[PDB]
Design a protein around this ligand. Structure first.
Ligand SMILES: Nc1ncnc2c1ncn2[C@@H]1O[C@H](COP(=O)(O)OP(=O)(O)O)[C@@H](O)[C@H]1O
Ligand SMILES: [Ca+2]
Ligand SMILES: [Ca+2]
Ligand SMILES: [Ca+2]
Ligand SMILES: [Mg+2]
Ligand SMILES: [Mg+2]
Ligand SMILES: [Mg+2]
Length: 439
């Protein structure tokens, strides 16, 4: 598309907004930019020529624009944007700009949880085939930074927020991995409104990879001839457990024993299935995609085995900052002895009731900490202890573990009451696991 001579206004000075600034400058267009923060981080990366307004939105700049490029962090429902829309001003996001320029096929991945794992895994499948693949879309690698005529395949992680402002995506393969009650400040009409944003990913997709276990991932008018499913018990791509072992199964055929993989957890096995389905649909060779499943290490803090010693597996799932992530960790969980489950932090008013279903059984102990520890201990008080900190909780459980046990940090909560971020929480857990369980 051609933006020469247009009055372009960008909202957001995070890395996404900065990537939009670069996009227009590279095309000889000098945009204006605004951010509601007084001192956004990206301010000191801007060139002198770019007019900027911080500390609020600038309504007259919006109402004068030919094109508004909105960060995913502001809602189309914000009054200033609604007023611009009412005036007929075009509002797009970075992904819309990307889709108008992309000259290679796009694999598009959304869902409440699992996006970065599946996106990274599809990217590894492409790399194993020797494809110059561009993987991005998260806040650390905005999609526009990937645009290059040398790129042969794009693999994008897309949020519901980005999909709301995107109309031109034509994915070769698209998935909604799952939909769980989250992000509800932005979706005041509930789960079906959150879903509706994600459902946009299937518009004009050639193949829709759907979750056989989550009906909210089905396209809006239902399953159609484009749909390929993945699931635990059944689907085009599913899991087979027999005689103590587990295999990935595709169209009625085992393709891989999961012992060849480096990932753990049933939900990571279904992530592997979704990735394989997407890669297959994209035209990547099956053999190299399976090879990638055997070499992919997984991402830090995503149900990550940081120590396996003396028959005890210590699992850093610090990125489980919400209930849906921890529920998926507990569902189908394989533990020979006792699960020592670490829950805690700032739960952001979540309903933890869903976790109760998994917390019966004589082989579970809860160790609850942080701001909302008392609420988490209440799930099942007779097997629960409460401490202030994660380290205190780990020192409580360490003398009790036995071969066959699992120590799982899957907090279901944000870390910011006690840590700088979830990476610091997971790194501290890994340090303590080695101190306390390594000998
Ligand atoms: N398919 C899934 N369903 C639910 N939770 C998942 C799934 N895949 C991974 N998770 C968990 O969600 C958290 C974030 O995983 P990640 O792959 O970073 O997702 P996202 O990029 O969507 O934030 C981790 O706790 C991880 O174990
Ligand atoms: Ca802003
Ligand atoms: Ca206490
Ligand atoms: Ca956090
Ligand atoms: Mg992500
Ligand atoms: Mg079901
Ligand atoms: Mg609170």
């Amino acid at each position: 598309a051609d933006y020469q001579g247009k009055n372009v206004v960008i909202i957001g000075l995070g890395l996404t907004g900065l990537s939009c600034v670069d996009f227009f400058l590279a095309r000889g267009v000098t945009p204006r930019v605004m951010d509601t923060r007084m001192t956004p981080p990206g301010l000191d990366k801007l060139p002198e020529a770019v007019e900027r307004h911080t500390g609020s939105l600038n309504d007259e700049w919006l109402m004068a624009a030919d094109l508004i490029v909105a960060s995913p962090g502001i809602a189309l429902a914000h009054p200033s944007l609604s007023a611009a829309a009412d005036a007929g001003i075009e509002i797009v996001g970075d992904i819309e700009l990307f889709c108008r320029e992309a000259q290679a096929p796009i694999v598009a991945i959304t869902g409440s949880n699992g996006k970065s794992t599946v996106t990274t895994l599809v990217g590894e499948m492409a790399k194993a085939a020797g494809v110059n693949v561009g993987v991005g879309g998260n806040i650390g690698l905005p999609a526009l930074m990937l645009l290059d005529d040398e790129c042969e395949l794009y693999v994008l992680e897309l949020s519901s927020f980005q999909l709301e402002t995107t109309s031109s995506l034509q994915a070769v393969a698209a998935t909604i991995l799952n939909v769980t009650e989250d992000h509800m400040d932005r979706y005041p009409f509930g789960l079906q409104q959150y879903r509706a944003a994600k459902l946009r990913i299937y518009e004009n997709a050639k193949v829709c990879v759907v979750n056989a276990d989550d009906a909210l991932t089905m396209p809006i008018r239902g399953a159609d001839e484009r749909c390929v499913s993945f699931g635990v018990n059944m689907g085009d791509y599913h899991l087979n457990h027999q005689q103590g072992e587990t295999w990935l199964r595709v169209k009625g055929e085992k393709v891989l024993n999961v012992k060849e993989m480096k990932l753990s957890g049933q939900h990571n096995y279904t992530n592997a299935l979704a990735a394989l389905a997407l890669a297959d649909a994209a035209g990547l060779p099956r053999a190299s995609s399976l090879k990638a499943l055997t070499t992919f290490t997984g991402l830090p803090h995503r149900f990550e085995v940081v120590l396996e010693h003396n028959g005890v597996r210590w699992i850093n799932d610090s990125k489980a900052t919400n209930v849906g992530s921890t529920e998926a960790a507990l569902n189908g969980l394989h533990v020979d002895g006792t699960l020592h489950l670490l829950l805690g932090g700032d739960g952001k008013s979540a309903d933890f009731s869903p976790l109760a279903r998994y917390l019966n059984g004589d082989n579970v102990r809860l160790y609850c900490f942080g701001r909302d520890g008392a609420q988490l201990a209440a799930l099942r008080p007779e097997v629960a202890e409460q401490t202030e900190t994660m380290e205190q909780a780990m020192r409580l459980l360490a003398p009790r573990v036995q071969p066959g046990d699992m120590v799982l940090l899957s907090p279901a909560c944000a870390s910011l009451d006690q840590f700088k971020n979830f990476e610091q929480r997971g790194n501290e857990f890994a340090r303590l696991a080695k101190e306390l369980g390594g000998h």
